[PDB]
Every structure is written in structure tokens, then in C-alpha cells.
Amino acid sequence: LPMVGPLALFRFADGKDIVLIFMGTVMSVAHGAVLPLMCIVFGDMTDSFIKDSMTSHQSTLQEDMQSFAIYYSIMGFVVLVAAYMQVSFWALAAGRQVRRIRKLFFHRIMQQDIGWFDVNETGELNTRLTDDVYKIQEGIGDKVGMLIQAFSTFITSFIIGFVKGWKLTLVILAVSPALGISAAIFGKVLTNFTAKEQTAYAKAGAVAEEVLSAIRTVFAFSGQDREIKRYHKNLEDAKNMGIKKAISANIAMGFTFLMIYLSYALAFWYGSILIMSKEYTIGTVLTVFFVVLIGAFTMGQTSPNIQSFASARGAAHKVYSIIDNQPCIDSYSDAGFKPDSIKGNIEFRNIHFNYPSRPDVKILNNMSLSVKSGQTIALVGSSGCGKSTTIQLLQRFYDPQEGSVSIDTHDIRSLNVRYLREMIGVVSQEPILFATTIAENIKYGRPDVTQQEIEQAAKEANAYDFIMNLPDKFETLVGDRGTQMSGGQKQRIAIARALVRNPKILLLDEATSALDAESETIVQAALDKVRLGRTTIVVAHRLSTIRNADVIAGFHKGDVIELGTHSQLMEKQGVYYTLVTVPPVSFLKVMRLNLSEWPYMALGTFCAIINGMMQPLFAVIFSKIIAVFAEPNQEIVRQKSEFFSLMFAAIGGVTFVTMFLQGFCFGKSGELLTLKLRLGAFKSMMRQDLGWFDNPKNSVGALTTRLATDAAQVQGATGVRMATLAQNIANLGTSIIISFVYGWELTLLILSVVPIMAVAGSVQMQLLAGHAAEDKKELEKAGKIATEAIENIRTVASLTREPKFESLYQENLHVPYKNSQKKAHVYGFTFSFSQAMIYFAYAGCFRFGAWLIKEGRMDAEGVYLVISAVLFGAMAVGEANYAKAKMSASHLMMLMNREPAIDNLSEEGQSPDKFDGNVRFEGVKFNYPSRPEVPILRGLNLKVSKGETLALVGSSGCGKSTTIQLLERFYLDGISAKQLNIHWLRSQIGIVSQEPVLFDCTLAENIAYGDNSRTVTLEEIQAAAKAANIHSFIENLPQGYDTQAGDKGTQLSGGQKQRIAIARAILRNPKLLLLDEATSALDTESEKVVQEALDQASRGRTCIVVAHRLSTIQNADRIAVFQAGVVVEQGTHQQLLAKKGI
Ligand SMILES: Clc1ccc(C(c2ccc(Cl)cc2)C(Cl)(Cl)Cl)cc1
């Protein structure tokens, strides 16, 4: 997308904004510099500690630490002041820029031509306003400041690192390709296994969605278990691939960890080697290592601010392009002539018009008609071809592309737009009143009269009928929006607003339609009465306005043909001759699902606690490496440095193997849990009632996405949640115990400062709740008035009251500005304290450690071990979705055990071998949850016995919706409804689904599907297909019945689909067939073939015709009707055939 550079992004910065920007940039540079200086002083402090320890195998530690502590405090103060001031200046600049941007943007929008409004209109502009203003505010806000600080810190870190230790800096840098190639291998393996995992998961999700989409036919057939088998097998394969992906990702992360630790080890070994030669001192190596580390990590961390800068740049580009767009018609400029008086005439000389958007359409061609003032001229049209366009034009909404206007020897182009607009009075068909009092709404219009005639106008508009006895005499506090008016009321206030001193001319554009009869009469009377005294040309189609007239205007497609009497219009064949015209599940209940796989979770937790404890060991090894650089014997130094670098590598390897094992076990547990949850959820889906599913929240898409996503998400709350919490607990507990043992004093001091980091945020949240509230509310209401302005641009411009809307917008914007400044200041203080607290804690803790060292309670490395352990524990926890996983698990649990509302999978009940053929329904009062309000079902008492051919037609909304669904046992034959063997009833039926849905498998498999209790034999499949007449077309196929049919829905006709559906149905060879108007949506020949096949299959077999056309119903015995689930209009075929004459 287009993006502007820095020069344009800040174009709307004045001098006041520029000074703030300059100060912010300079202060941010200083802030960025401060951290590398911190590292330099840290290295010097380490050197001083080592010197004191070396002397004892002096008091200079006390004074040296005192000086370094004063240094640390001054760094703290400078960072506090600098960071607060940087954030404050940048936020203030953002606020001023955003305020001016909103002002100018709305000003320009209101300026744009209507020919430009119609091109993007309200949605684009409101989106732009909200989103893009957010983007621009976030761009030039604190984010650019953080970018500048990142640059400064990176450059300063590199320069100090080079200037101090060019050799060791070069070594650290040259170790970077190691991490680079580690990441390369990471990406390779990740991409390969990720693609494989997507393929595997999709292979099962496809079957999931195939079943869910066609659940009706999937379940109507006794094939609810073969689906379970298919899902089980596909999900087992997906489990294998998923565990492969998990182990791959874990090994990649472990290799990254191993390589970073190996980089540490090599760097420290080289530092030792140099120190032995006495080139770099321990302080120097520590300084250079930490400065390079901080530089790298800071560049990484401010990578995300780059994206914010870029998005802000793009949004700014579009906003600025809107700002600079100059409308062809200037609604604000005062350039033009203002004739002191105007006779009020109107003329047009072949004004050619085309909409700026899609100018190919040409409606106004050769429009030439004049109306001398003091006259009223009627208008007509069929599609509103010309009238709307010309009424828009007279308002200067669209520039006359070719023509001349000679209004009293004046051209509308050459006169002031505001004077022209106010010179005439026009109101839309339904002008949505602005969110104000009715008095203020009538005041809108001509402010020339403010109160005195504003109250008088009511008497003219026939609105007073309620105003005098309204809730208030003229409506203070009435508001509107919350209160509702009748259409006649809105129209009456509209005519009042029009008649508030409309100077000469008054027009109305289809201002009569969409009105009740009483309102129609009232408004017609009002229009008639207000016609007198001024030149009126109203666009309308009503008969009353049609008959009343003094002149006529005729252009049915934009063809001016008539300008005279009414009788002439009649003679002109006009319309005057066509007058006829969810309890959040707890942790324990979630773990009850992996209760089965606990063996894997146990080893996972054990290896996780080992992984966590490894971090404190890394802190302790850091303490020991720092301490062991103070040994006078050089050989001992080499031995210890070699051993500790080796132990660094060993901790890396332990972390690597432990991450690998963790990956293996937690992946396996998570995949087993996912398979179990998916299988249980699918089983619950199948068994549950049919009326459940059609619910909008139970949409096929909803269930599919739930199965795909929430299933995996649930892994986030059983093992990995336990693993992460165990790792964190082990890390902090071990760190705290080690620190306590080394010395409870410094342990307590660092622990006591730990609260100050976060607890200080309580005030931040207190002041930020107000921020969020004002943000949502003020955005909503300011944008609401913006949407009112833009969406009613027609009226807003025609009212000539754009400035008044601007003033309302600005007054609304006032409070957000103050709240934004408060937010800037409070965020600035919180950020400054968060930044300076680390420096202050360093200073205080190290001074205390010096004291304890002198007293004798803490060894030289005691302070380093305790501080490093606590700091690295904090970092580890900070590095280390749970609520989302809990929510998904709650939904899945309530799903898998919701209720057996209509137990369908219940294979209970007794099934006599013989089915007597009774379709009797006794005492069943039910109603569909889809249509419970509408009478669906009552004490149904329908009758059909064996050998019948009953037909039916539903007068109201496809009566099939009732009888087949009920009889199909979706919602009894002499036996109780639920006592019967539902499996037997579902098995012994010839129900044909409406739309034949075939399954993604062999045609042989689809044929065999009709039965799933017993396997299939090819001989019988052929028998059924030939009996189904489908063999005819199947005779030409790649392999025939067994064909995979790799087309997957191309080489199949509707008739072929119906034939295969019938073959599937009759595979059971049932003795009672049922239809659901399936034999439809096909060509006449296809339907004839379908009926021929069905009749052939009906040879010596009972059926119930439920077809939709007489062609099928020809071979029928009796026809029926059903209303509200009760027998009605039962009769013989000939009688009801006479009924449905059609
Ligand atoms: Cl497992 C782990 C621990 C610490 C780290 C980092 C780290 C890097 C350098 C140093 Cl000296 C300490 C910790 C962060 Cl958390 Cl600070 Cl980003 C990374 C991974």
C-alpha cells in the first residue's frame, strides 16, 4: 500500500508541535544512550568487586561502590526525567496533530463535492475516521519515540563495545552466523512438518464437515457408526502426524536454546583466554558482552514498532490524500455575486449531466425548460429518471457538464453557493431529524430567525396540532432517537423547516410517499397552503398533487415534452391515461479428561521441573564464573574457566534433551486428549436431537470450527498449562531458596522491591479505566454525529448548515482532548517509574551487598548469585491463552454432555419381525424449536395403513416440513413413540432425502451405505443398482461401482444423483417407502425417469407419495392436507384433484 515519508507525515505540525517533536527526539536519544552507559558502569562495578575479592584471596570497595552507587542514582534520575518528558512531549504532539487532523479532515469532508461523496459515502469515511485516526495517533505518538530510543541504544552500544573490546566484540558478532544457521534449520523443519500436519488434520476435518453438513441423511440412514470408524481412523493418522509436528517444533526450539547457550560458553571462554593475557579485564569483558547483548535484543524488541510506523504511514497517506482533494464546487469560499434581489425565475439550456461515478449513463440530454416565478409546475416520471437528477442539480450537487443556466441573467455557477442554496427551500423524502430537540431541529435551516419566527413557523406546518399539547409547548429535552415520531410528524416538521423563511423558491423531492392516508392528506394540505406566495416545483406521484397544478412538466426518461396545461398531459398518453397506475469449568474437571493419559503427563511434569530448575543453575554458574576470575594462580584460572564453559555447554545440552523429552510427552498427551475429545464430541453430536442442529449457533460452520480449533485449544489447559506453571514454580522456588540460603537480607530487599515494579500499576489501572471508558464512549458519539453528517450529506448541504455540524463535532471533541492529555501524563509517569526502578534497584541492592560483604555475612559471589538469580527468575517468568483454553474446554464439555434431548442413538426397545404398516400417530403434542410460535404440531392423528399410497399438499409453507420429519422419527404405528426400537424403525423405511447428497468415497461405498449393520456384497450392489436403473449410466465409467470417481462432483447428473440415492435407500429392500418431495429441481425427462424408476421399485411394495407434482401423484390412492399438525381435507384422489384445479 502507498505510504508517505517522514516529511509528509508531520506536515500538520506547527511551530508548537515542532518544538515538542524536537525536544522529544533529543530526550529520547539521551534515554537510549543511558542504558549502554549503565552497562559500562556495571562492568566497572564488577571489576571493583573482583579487586576487593582478589585482595582477600581493601576499604576501596566501600568508596568505589559508593561512587558507582551515586552514578547509578544519577542515571536513574536522568532516565526518569528524560523518559517521562519524552513520552509527554511525543504524546502532546500526537494529541495536537490528531486534533488538527480531525478538524481539517471533517472540514474537508464537508467541503467535498456531492459528486465525490457518492463515490465513497459513509462507510469509507467513518472507517477512515476511527481506524486511521487511531493509526496516525499511534504512529507519531510514543512509538516513534521508542524507535528513536532503539536506534540510539543500538548505535551507542555498538560504538562503546567496539571502542572497548574490538576483538571480543568481533568474536561475539562472528558467532551470530551460528544462530543464523540454527534458525535456518529451525525454519526448514518447521515448514516441512507444519505442511504435513495441515494435510493430516485436513484429511479428518473434511470427513467431519461432510458428516456435519449432511447430518440429516447421515443419521436417517443407520450409518452413525461407520462414520465413527472413519473419524477414528482418520484422527489416529492425524494424531501420528500431529505428534511428529510437535516433536519437530520442540526439537527446533531446543536446538535454538542449545546454540544460544553454546554462544555464551564460547564467548566466556574467549574472554577468559584474553584475561589470562591481561588484555581485557573481567570488567571489560562483562561490559562488552552485556552491551552487545542489549543492543541485539533492543533491535529485536523494537522490530514490532516498525510495523506500527508503517501502518500509521499508510493510514496517514489515505487521510492526507482526502485532505488535499479540492472539490470542484467550493461550499465555503465567499467568491461569487449576491444579487440584492432575485425575481426567482429558473431556466435550463440543454444541461447535460452524468454521475461522476459511472459517467456512461446519460439521462439528462436536451433538458430545456423554464419556469417564470410565481408559477407552480407539475413533474412526472416512471423510474424517477430525470426529476431527482434535476432537483439535485438545482442545488448545485453535480456540476453541469454541458449546458447554460440563465436564472434572471445569472448563472448558478457564477453565484455564491451558500446564497444560492439558502435562496431555495428543499427537503428530502424523509429527512432524518438530527439528534436534537424539535425546537432545535426547526431552528436548523435559516438562522436568520433564531427564536421569534422559529416559534411562529409551527403555526404554518400543521405540526402545532401536537406542539401546543405536546409533552412541552415547543419541546425542550425531547431529544428524539430515543423517542419516536410518526412519519406524518417528521414530514410536518420538515415542511416547517422548509418554510422557515425560504426566500423565493421551494421544492420537495418525492416528499409525499411512505406516508399513511391521514398523514398523506395533512401533508398535501400543508403543501397546497405553502405553495401560495412562492414559486413551487414539487416532485411527487400522488393523485392529489397531480390534479392540483398550474403548469406541467413532462420527462418520463428525461425527455422534456410538455410544459403547459393538464389536459395536454392527458392527451400526451402520460400516466394520466394509465391512471390505474456455561459454568466455567474448573482445573480439576478439565484434568479429569487426561486422567487416562496421566503416565505421560507425569514424566512431562518431571522433565519440566528439571528444565525450570536448570535456570537457577545457570544463575549459579554465572556467579561462579564471575567469582573465579579472581584467582592468583593462572593455571587454576584456565582450569576453572574451561570447566565452567564446559558446564555451560552441559546445561545447554541438558536443556536441549529435556525440551526434547518435554515435547515428546506433552505432545503425546495433548494429542491423545485431542483425539479423545474429538471422538467424544462427535459421538455426542451424532446421538443428539435433530432439532438441536438447525439452531443458528449450531451451524455446520460453527461446529466444524469448534472441532478444529477448540479441540486443540483444550490442550492449553491440561498438560502444557500444568507444565508451564510447574516450570515457573520450580524456577521461582529454587531461585528464592538459593537466594535465601546465600543471604536472607539481600533476598528480602530484592523481594520487597519486586512489588514496586507492578503494584505501582494500580494507579495506572485506576486512571486507565477512565481512559478506556472515554475512548469507547467519545469515539462512539463523535463518530455518531460524523455518521449523521456524512450519511445525510444531502440534507446537511441542502440545509447549508455544514458549519453548525462542524461546531457540534468540535465541541464533542473537546473532552477527549483533555482526557488524552491526562492519559499522556499518567502513562508517562508510569513508564518513567517502570524504567527508573530497575536502575534504583541496582543501586540499592549493590550498596547493601557491599555492606553485607564488609560485615562478613555474604561472600564476594553471594551478591552476584542472589541478584542474578532473582533477576533471571523474573526474566524467565516474564517470558513464561489459558482462559481461552478454559472457555473452549467448557464449551466442549457442555457439548459432549449437554443432554439426550431426543435420544436417537439409544438402541433400546423391542422390534417385532413384521411391520404392520400403520402410520398412526396417537397423542403427540409437540412443536419444532425452529418454528414454535407458528402452529407446527398438535395432537396428530393421521392414518395410513399397509398398501396405501397417500398423497398430501400443504397450503401453508410446504406442509412436508411436518409429516415426514415427524414420521421419520426426527421429532406411533400402534406403539409408544420412544418405547419403540428406534433402530428398527430407522432401518425399516424407504425415506428419500430431498436433495441427494453423496459421500466422498467409491460409488460402491455410497451404494453400500444404505446399510451399515451388515457388510455388502458386489452381487447385491449390482442387483440394487440395476433395480435402481442407475446401472445404465454407470456402465460407462472408469471402473464402475468401485470407482473413486476422481471428479468428485463433475460427471454426475441430477437424475443420476437421484437414482443413486434411491439405490442407497432400497438397499435395505424395505416394504414402506417415504418421499420428501425429493423428485424435483430436475428436467421433465429426468423427473419422468425418476418416477419410472420409483414405480418400478414400487412393484409389490408399499409407499407413501409425498411428491410435489401431479405427474408423480398420478399413481396415487388418496390425497390429504395437514394444518398445524392435524388431519384436514382427507379425500380420494379424484376429489382432492378437483380441489387443486391449478
Ligand atoms: Cl529460557 C530463557 C531465559 C532467559 C532468556 C533471555 C536472557 C537473555 C540474556 C541474559 Cl544475560 C538473561 C536472560 C531473556 Cl528472558 Cl532476558 Cl529475553 C531467554 C530464554
Nearest residue CA, atom 7 of ligand 1?
A: 875
Pick from 44, 7, 148, 20: which is nearest to 93 by CA? 20
Q: Grid coordinates in use for 394?
A: 438545482
Nearest residue CA, atom 2 of ligand 1?
A: 876
Query: Got the DSSP string for 932-975?
Result: SSS----S------TT---EE--TTT-THHHHHHHHTT---TTS
Count of CB atoms within 10 A of residue 380's CB?
A: 22
Pick from 504, 338, 327: which is nearest to 410 by CA? 338
Nearest residue CA, atom 12 of ligand 1?
A: 872
Query: Which amino acid type is present at position 32?
Result: G
Q: Is ligand 1 within 6 A of the CB of residue 140?
A: no
Q: Is ligand 1 within 6 A of the CB of residue 293?
A: yes
Q: Do residues 472 and 455 lie in contact, with contact meaning Cβ atoms separated by under 8 Å?
A: no
Q: Is ligand 1 within 6 A of the CB of residue 876?
A: yes
For the CA of 875, the nearest atom of ligand 1: 15
**What are 280-285's contacts with CB under 8 Å, separation 24+?**
280/165, 280/167, 280/168, 281/47, 282/46, 282/47, 282/50, 282/626, 282/629, 282/630, 283/43, 283/44, 283/45, 283/46, 283/47, 283/48, 283/50, 284/43, 284/47, 284/164, 284/165, 285/43, 285/165, 285/168
Q: Is ligand 1 within 6 A of the CB of residue 758?
A: no
**Cα dihedral 635, 636, 640, 643 sign:** positive
Name the residue with cell 436417537: 904
Query: Which amino acid type is present at position 185?
Result: I
Q: How far apart are CA 207 and CA 770, in angstroms?
A: 50
Q: Please enumerate in sequence order all residues whose Cβ is within 8 A of that of 606, keeping only pairs 6 or more positions apart, or say none.
A: none
Q: Which helix (H) or strand (E) holds 536?
A: strand 535-539
Q: At 1116, give phi and psi (nearest 5°).
A: -135, 160
Q: What is the dihedral of CA 959, 961, 966, 967, to 10 degrees?
A: 70
Cα 618-619-622 angle, rounded to 5 deg: 85
Tell me the structure's resolution in angstroms, rounded to a single decimal: 3.9
Q: Is ligand 1 within 6 A of the CB of residue 258?
A: no
Q: Is ligand 1 within 6 A of the CB of residue 619?
A: no
- Specify the pairing of strand 551-552 against strand 377-378: parallel
- Alpha-carbon distance values, 343 to 7, 528, 532 (Å): 53, 22, 16
Residue 1121: beta bridge partners? Answer: 1128
Query: Got the DSSP string for 116-130?
Result: HHHHHHHHHHHHIII
For the CA of 655, the nearest atom of ligand 1: 1
Q: Do residues 375 and 563 lie in contact, with contact meaning Cβ atoms separated by under 8 Å?
A: no
Q: Do residues 918 and 974 lie in contact, with contact meaning Cβ atoms separated by under 8 Å?
A: yes
For the CA of 879, the nearest atom of ligand 1: 15
Cα 302-307-312 angle, rounded to 5 deg: 120
Distance 250 CA to ligand 1 centre (A): 18
Q: Which helix (H) or strand (E) holds 402?
A: strand 402-404
Q: Do residues 936 and 927 lie in contact, with contact meaning Cβ atoms separated by under 8 Å?
A: yes
Query: Which amino acid type is present at position 790?
Result: I
Pick from 222, 154, 383, 235: which is nearest to 988 by CA? 222
Q: Do residues 510 and 384 lie in contact, with contact meaning Cβ atoms separated by under 8 Å?
A: yes
- The radius of gyration of the chain from alpha carbons, rounded to an integer in Å, stands at 42
Q: Is ligand 1 within 6 A of the CB of residue 875?
A: yes
Name the residue with cell 394509465: 578
Residue 1131: beta bridge partners? Answer: 1119
Q: Is ligand 1 within 6 A of the CB of residue 872?
A: yes
- Alpha-carbon distance values, 962 to 100, 421, 860, 966, 972 (Å): 64, 62, 87, 6, 15
Q: Grid coordinates in use for 24?
A: 522529544
CB-count burial class (<10 Å; 0-12, 13-18, 19+) for 856: exposed
Q: Is ligand 1 within 6 A of the CB of residue 905?
A: no
Q: Grid coordinates in use for 6?
A: 517522514
Q: Which helix (H) or strand (E) holds 456?
A: helix 452-457
507 Cα distance to chain centroid = 45
Distance 651 CA to ligand 1 centre (A): 14
Distance 193 CA to ligand 1 centre (A): 27
Q: How far apart are CA 511 and CA 388, in angstroms?
A: 12
Distance 249 CA to ligand 1 centre (A): 20
53 Cα distance to chain centroid = 61
Pick from 645, 1138, 593, 518: which is nearest to 896 by CA? 593
User: Ligand 1, residues 259, 618, 875: which to mutate, most atoms within 8 A of Cβ?
Assistant: 875
Q: Which helix (H) or strand (E) holds 509?
A: strand 505-509
Would you mind telling me the total number of residues written for the chain in this entry?
Answer: 1142
Pick from 582, 587, 598, 894: which is nearest to 716 by CA? 587
Q: Grid coordinates in use for 754?
A: 519486586
Pick from 1094, 1096, 1028, 1035: which is nearest to 1064 by CA? 1028
* CATH assignment, 1-173+281-336+746-857: 1.20.1560.10
Nearest residue CA, atom 1 of ligand 1?
A: 876
Residue 402: beta bridge partners? Answer: 352
Report how many helices (DSSP H) and strands (DSSP E) the chain contains, helices first: 42, 13
- Specify the pairing of strand 1118-1122 against strand 377-378: unpaired
Q: How far apart are CA 179 and CA 257, in angstroms?
A: 10
Q: At 1074, give phi and psi (nearest 5°).
A: -130, 140
Q: Grid coordinates in use for 410?
A: 445569472
Q: Do residues 33 and 156 lie in contact, with contact meaning Cβ atoms separated by under 8 Å?
A: yes
Nearest residue CA, atom 18 of ligand 1?
A: 876
Nearest residue CA, atom 16 of ligand 1?
A: 875
Q: Please enumerate in sequence order all residues whose Cβ is within 8 A of that of 1085, keeping only pairs 6 or more positions apart, or say none.
A: 1055
Q: What is the DSSP letter of 554?
A: B
First to last CA, the chain: 61
The half-sphere exposure of 364 on its side-chain side, counting CA atoms within 13 A, is 27
Query: Which amino acid type is present at position 287?
Result: T
Q: Grid coordinates in use for 892?
A: 466442549
Query: Which amino acid type is present at position 12?
Result: F
Name the residue with cell 486511521: 132
Residue 407: beta bridge partners? Answer: 410
Query: What are the start-end ranges of the E strands in 1029-1108?
Result: 1072-1074, 1102-1104
- Specify the pairing of strand 1072-1074 against strand 990-991: parallel
**Cα dihedral 1092, 1098, 1100, 1103 sign:** negative
Q: What is the DSSP letter of 1125?
A: S
Query: Which amino acid type is present at position 398?
Result: Y
Distance 253 CA to ligand 1 centre (A): 14
Q: Grid coordinates in use for 925?
A: 403434542
Class of domain 951-1139: alpha beta
Distance 1092 CA to ligand 1 centre (A): 78
Distance 876 CA to ligand 1 centre (A): 7
Q: At 760, give phi and psi (nearest 5°).
A: -60, -25
Structure method? cryo-EM
Q: Quick one: angle between helices 860-879 and 744-759, nearest 10?
A: 30
Query: Which amino acid type is present at position 345?
Result: N
Q: Is ligand 1 within 6 A of the CB of residue 449?
A: no
Q: Which helix (H) or strand (E) holds 781?
A: helix 761-791
Nearest residue CA, atom 4 of ligand 1?
A: 876
Q: Do residues 232 and 187 lie in contact, with contact meaning Cβ atoms separated by under 8 Å?
A: no
Q: Do residues 196 and 244 lie in contact, with contact meaning Cβ atoms separated by under 8 Å?
A: yes
Query: Which amino acid type is present at position 932?
Result: P
CATH 3.40.50.300 residue window(s) in the chain = 349-562, 951-1139
Name the residue with cell 474448573: 586
Q: Grid coordinates in use for 203?
A: 484429511
CATH 1.20.1560.10 residue window(s) in the chain = 1-173+281-336+746-857
Nearest residue CA, atom 8 of ligand 1?
A: 293
Q: How far apart are CA 722 and CA 718, in angstroms?
A: 6
Distance 260 CA to ligand 1 centre (A): 10
Q: Do residues 375 and 535 lie in contact, with contact meaning Cβ atoms separated by under 8 Å?
A: yes
- Alpha-carbon distance values, 509 to 361, 391, 427, 442, 771 (Å): 21, 7, 7, 19, 45
Q: Do residues 1128 and 955 lie in contact, with contact meaning Cβ atoms separated by under 8 Å?
A: no
Helices (H), 943-1083: 960-967, 982-987, 1003-1009, 1018-1027, 1031-1034, 1054-1066
Q: Is ligand 1 within 6 A of the CB of residue 871?
A: no
Pick from 260, 258, 249: which is nearest to 653 by CA? 258
* CATH assignment, 349-562: 3.40.50.300
Q: How far apart are CA 180 and CA 75, in angstroms?
A: 35
Q: Is ligand 1 within 6 A of the CB of residue 260?
A: no
Nearest residue CA, atom 3 of ligand 1?
A: 876
Cα 670-674-678 angle, rounded to 5 deg: 175
